[PDB]
Ligand binder design. Sequence first.
Ligand code: HEM
Ligand code: HEM
Ligand SMILES: CO/C=C(/C(=O)OC)c1ccccc1CSc1nc2cc(OC)ccc2s1
Ligand SMILES: CCCCCCCCO[C@@H]1O[C@H](CO)[C@@H](O)[C@H](O)[C@H]1O
Lengths: 380, 101, 44, 48, 146, 61
Amino acid sequence: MAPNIRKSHPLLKMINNSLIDLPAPSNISAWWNFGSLLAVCLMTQILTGLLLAMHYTADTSLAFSSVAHTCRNVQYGWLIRNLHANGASFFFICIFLHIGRGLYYGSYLYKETWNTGVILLLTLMATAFVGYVLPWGQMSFWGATVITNLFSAIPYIGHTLVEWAWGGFSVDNPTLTRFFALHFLLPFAIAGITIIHLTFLHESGSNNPLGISSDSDKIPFHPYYSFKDILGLTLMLTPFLTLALFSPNLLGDPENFTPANPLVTPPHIKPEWYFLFAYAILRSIPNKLGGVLALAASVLILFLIPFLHKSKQRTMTFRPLSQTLFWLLVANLLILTWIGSQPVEHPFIIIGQMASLSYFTILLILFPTIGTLENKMLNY
Amino acid sequence: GRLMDRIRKWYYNAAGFNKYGLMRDDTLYEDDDVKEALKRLPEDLYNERMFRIKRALDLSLKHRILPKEQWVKYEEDKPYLEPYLKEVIRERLEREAWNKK
Amino acid sequence: XXXXXXXXXXXXXXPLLCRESMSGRSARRDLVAGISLNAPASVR
Amino acid sequence: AEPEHDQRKRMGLKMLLISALLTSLLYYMKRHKWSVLKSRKMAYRPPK
Amino acid sequence: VEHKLCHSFQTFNTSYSDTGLFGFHFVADPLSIDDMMFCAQGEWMRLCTSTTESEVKRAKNHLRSAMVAQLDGTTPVCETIGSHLLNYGRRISLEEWDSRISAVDARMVRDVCSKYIYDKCPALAAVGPIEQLLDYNRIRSGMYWI
Amino acid sequence: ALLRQAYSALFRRTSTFALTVVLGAVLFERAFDQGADAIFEHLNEGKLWKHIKHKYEASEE
Ligand code: HEM
Ligand code: HEM
Ligand SMILES: CO/C=C(/C(=O)OC)c1ccccc1CSc1nc2cc(OC)ccc2s1
Ligand SMILES: CCCCCCCCO[C@@H]1O[C@H](CO)[C@@H](O)[C@H](O)[C@H]1O
């Protein structure tokens, strides 16, 4: 048989082959920490969400009040709401750095791992989207209104597609109850796909900053990265606990303290910060249908990353041209985040149209081009 | 017109894998072609490549590099794998063409 | 209780190149063959 | 608007003190374990 | 034997004037190293923790038969004598060795082993195809708790 | 030597180690709380309800 019961036990085995004896590159950096962060953050959101859901009432006449009652009457309910709301932001911060890492270190060449990643992102966006409607504030209702009303731009099938999703003729109680059910359900899908996400990863193991074969120097996950991750956890968890316990209402619209009123449109209907870049791209195209496509394309473009790799080397570490072009894109996304938070007027309009134009240009054209141009400077 | 040599030598230094004591062909991403070409490498060159890579890996986890003295010069870089890789590709292109006709 | 152990790889089978560290071995008798319950197998 | 105002900041104090303590301790334990690799030296010695 | 862990393994207590080297050495196939090292370190902990009187009653009998076998001939007696003076300052008769050995019990073996082995940073020499055995930290953690 | 003795008496055996963690946490909590509450209350002198409490009860009503 097998000596110990750590390599034998079919339960303790994949516990062992994933978090104990799993071979990892000796030189992966802190940019490889955000994987385990997302994992813990997911388990954190699910737990804080469950605790909130045990006091929530999915009804347009009780939604706002039930959430308020949770903060005011439930023991540490103010905190659980605080952690869950800001934890959703910690999720997106970690996932944007998780993605940015892969784009920089050519991790997308793990296509199965990468594709399951994009799907995980898309499910996360949908999860945070429907969760925002639950407190049923002004920004909740009108955020749900503006976004879902876009689907009616689809020809023929469109206007029916919307009223079906609504369960009526506008966002109302039939929409809130199904969004709560959807918000309850989706995180468990994220949990499941994560297991698939990690499964495809363990096929090839982790990549490393240098982008070369790390078989010459592998170390066990425990204790090197078991300790490294926990460090990276408490390092990242301090600013957000500071955020959540000193400036809890810093990130969110104060408009969400005014109960949903379908007869008053908020002056500036902007999303949370992690949707701002996508919101800006949405409003770049004045056409309603084109805007929807441009919005969908802004995230679905990640599927085209592996097919746009033309460089003979995997990472960007030894690629100075691709490096600055990468940081242009990162700065590009900041400018988009900024534009999305601003009204649709000059000069914000033309700035947004250019920033969103360059966003696709860098990813579709310049990145595979500069990569090629680099290869010929390497004499290939 | 010694411009092309000016640009290549510039990029080689700007790349900075020579700081890790790596050859140009050390940083090659191992696709199906590179993998095959590597298996054709002589024992000595292969065992040497293995050390250079493991050294670069060890350096990378230290966040250190080699002393300026130990940096691979542009003119001293050995394209040890490139002749092998070209034949591997040439052979494959033949099969791909021969399987269409 | 004494004697040094060994082991080789089979299928093909699995310190003798000097004048002195190879010497002391050139067949004096013929060939004895030993095997033990708890001691390494020997040969002469 | 937020009656938890006082307790929230009281927690923020306890958090920051604990977090500062724990982050430091965990940093040592990480560096301690990784000291094996961080100091490690290697040589290439063939029968050349 | 049960798990085909190694071709051979030996335990040694090489003593010097002011120091020594208590440890073990084994020869194994590239893919049986980690399991072998695992079991070996386990038995080290078993020494410091679980050693029974039944075990040492055998071990003492083996060591008795060992020291006597050590003096089979003139050369091995001369070797003992030439070393006993050089290291102990005197000759230790088999009669005296037996007295020291016969006083050894399980409680003592546990203590002495816990003193030199338990939670000590060991010295490691590894030669050959040695991938399966890796990380000093893992080996170091195998030095405590059976 | 505190370091040497803290090792052999507490940190060496895994059983004695765990007991130290428990015993140490119980003492740490009792201390950290009272200290933190003290640091917070002084930083807000006369502001808390426990401070202005004497005006409306336990003496006059
Ligand atoms: C809930 C969401 C996610 C979870 C829980 C998750 C989890 C993980 C974990 C634990 C790792 C290993 C540690 C690491 O490499 O950082 C990893 C690696 C990876 N993930 Fe994710 N991830 C998520 C989202 C994504 C997304 C959005 C993408 C891409 C768009 C992605 C693509 C990858 C890739 C390519 C790797 C390999 C990185 C490498 O080894 O170089 N993942 N993921
Ligand atoms: C990845 C996982 C999750 C994400 C990203 C997420 C995100 C969000 C967001 C952004 C809100 C808006 C709260 C606000 O801004 O005021 C919210 C609210 C809520 N979520 Fe989640 N959530 C997740 C998991 C869960 C789960 C698993 C449950 C229940 C089982 C849940 C239940 C709730 C409830 C009841 C609310 C209403 C409380 C409130 O509005 O603060 N959540 N969620
Ligand atoms: C119910 O609306 C939720 C909003 C939000 O920011 O949620 C966190 C919101 C509020 C105001 C204005 C706009 C929004 C949403 S903008 C947006 N929402 C989404 C949702 C997605 O799920 C796949 C994908 C892309 C996008 S872009
Ligand atoms: C790594 C993060 C650690 C955070 C530790 C926070 C501990 C908060 O502890 C809390 O403090 C409150 C204020 O006195 C008390 O009212 C609560 O009873 C107590 O549970």
